[PDB]
Design a protein around this nucleic acid. Sequence first.
DNA 1: ATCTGGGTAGTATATGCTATCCTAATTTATATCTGGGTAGCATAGGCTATCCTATC
DNA 2: GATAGGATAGCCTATGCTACCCAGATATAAATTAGGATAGCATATACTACCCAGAT
Lengths: 157, 157, 157, 160
Amino acid sequence: RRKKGGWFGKHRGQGGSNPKFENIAEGLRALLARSHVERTTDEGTWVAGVFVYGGSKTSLYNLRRGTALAIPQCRLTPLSRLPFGMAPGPGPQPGPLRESIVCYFMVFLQTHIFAEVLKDAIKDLVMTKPAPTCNIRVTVCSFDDGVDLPPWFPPMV
Amino acid sequence: KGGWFGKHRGQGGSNPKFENIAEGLRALLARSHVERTTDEGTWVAGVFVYGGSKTSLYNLRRGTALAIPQCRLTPLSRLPFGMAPGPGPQPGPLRESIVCYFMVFLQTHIFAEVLKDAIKDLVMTKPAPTCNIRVTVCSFDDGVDLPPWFPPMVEGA
Amino acid sequence: RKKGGWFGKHRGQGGSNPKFENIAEGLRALLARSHVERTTDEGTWVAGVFVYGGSKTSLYNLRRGTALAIPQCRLTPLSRLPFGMAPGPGPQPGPLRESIVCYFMVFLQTHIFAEVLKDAIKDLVMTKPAPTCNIRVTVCSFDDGVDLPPWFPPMVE
Amino acid sequence: RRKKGGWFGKHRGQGGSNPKFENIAEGLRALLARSHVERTTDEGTWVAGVFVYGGSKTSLYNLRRGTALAIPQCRLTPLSRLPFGMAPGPGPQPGPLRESIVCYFMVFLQTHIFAEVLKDAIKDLVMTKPAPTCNIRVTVCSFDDGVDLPPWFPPMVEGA
DNA sequence: ATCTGGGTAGTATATGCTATCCTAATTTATATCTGGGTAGCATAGGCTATCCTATC
DNA sequence: GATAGGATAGCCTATGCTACCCAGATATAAATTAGGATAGCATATACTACCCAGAT
């Protein structure tokens, strides 16, 4: 048939459970269970995370949602396009405002050891799969200053 | 104004306001020479100007585009909620606030930091609707493998 | 439900049967690995193959398969093996003594092709499980002669 | 006359002492005693089978019982029949499995220089006397390999 | 009272979500591919006179 | 004058030959579910000069 609903009542950030994302999250947290890791931090301030890019859009988004479900203590940026970086060799370099076709999403965590573990787990999860999935590159982040947005200084929640 | 002027997504350039903003930036950036370019081509750090407002951020994006040759910009995107004070419990991992951001990648730690510092100081000189701009030293060891194919690489080299 | 009684087929009716058909097909496929004549001009029986061991039914089936595979062979009926000299200088059994192990004997014309048939039967048995592998095969060389010239020309009289 | 039946005690492949079989065995042994040979092997390996055939059924069963008690190490089997073979004429040939009425029984002897002497004795002593028995031609199997020398289970003497 | 820069509506186009087809072990039948056991025709190895010549 | 000697039984011991119909191991096509992915409102920008009032 056609798309079962254009608009589902879910704005940005309204992400529910789904069997595909459920399986992806289960695989990730099984990979994330290979080492003693902490899902959160006491202060819960976002100064680190994971950078994931490359590959097709529909695979990058699914990987983002899977990382979300696997770590309910994470913060995720939306996908967006990319520009073209510096080319190798002394030639005509591209413009700053140009739009590529490569997508990316960013992860906001608290610590960096766990962020490295998450990046490694995502790398393994991608490596287990073919399709555009392997084209999805992953790198690290370290927001030493902060991505501060007032995180409701933790009481009982 | 309004309507499709025929210009596609990502067709902009010089303007006196962004020219002045970039003059201030480079004047701050010219107080100490740094290796603004890298041999490897791929960069090791990015820029994450967030805060202010969408209009101020877009103006600063243009003022950063026309500021240095070693800079390429993503479209502005929004930021995930730290923890929403609206409801009782914590929001979902995907919940995204109204604070915007955009990404431009700079090699080396000092050159990456000074662009953000100049942006902050310039918006501090400006009125307040833009003083709420804060940036972070998002340094990545493994780096980002951006696509280096410049738009004129189809018919030039 | 249907057992096997006297079908009127005397001692010598080598009628085709799918089990014996495929057994013989496999045998002559194995027998096709060497270039040895299946007959001799004078057609005098001075050699053959000796096959024994395993269950009675396996031995009979192997004999029928060798018959169908080589229409230029002569096959003796099955019977029970004797009690050969086992190790141990004790009360050796009677010379007439017979074991519970069955056997059948093949009468061919030459000896090189007889050894080829022996090896082919060995391989054919070896590629099988069940009591089939219990079947043993050894060679024969009737240098004296099992000659018995018939006087009945069954083709026309 | 005095034809009978019923159980007579002894089982399959068991010799007996009868004057006729005694005389046949004495003749064979006397022929076999003209030249000493290794009637058995130091490891008990038989490399020469025996294929007494021909004659008639009764004259062959009696020859079997006569050869039972004349040779130290022999492995005579129950009697069976023989395949037909050739056909009268160049072209036609009978079936492969077609078996004639000439009977035989298998024996085994160690070494190739005692099996031939057994053949000669079991041929002459039983053919150069009875008309209906003058057709037991022997084709003692002169193998170049071995057979199942120990086809025996541990319960020797039908005991332990 | 002009400066002044500095933010700023009003469209084509890329998104966070929710929807809809190739594949990939994963069973799972599906045929095979050989071994049991089925009887008259044949078959052993025992018997007390039978042998009947066949033989002295 | 019995016997050489095959041969003579006939039920005892129990062999097998012809051909199979079942009784399972053993590959092996074919499904099969299930895990990947590919898609629409409603927002989000980029570009559009221009407004347009701080800001004196």
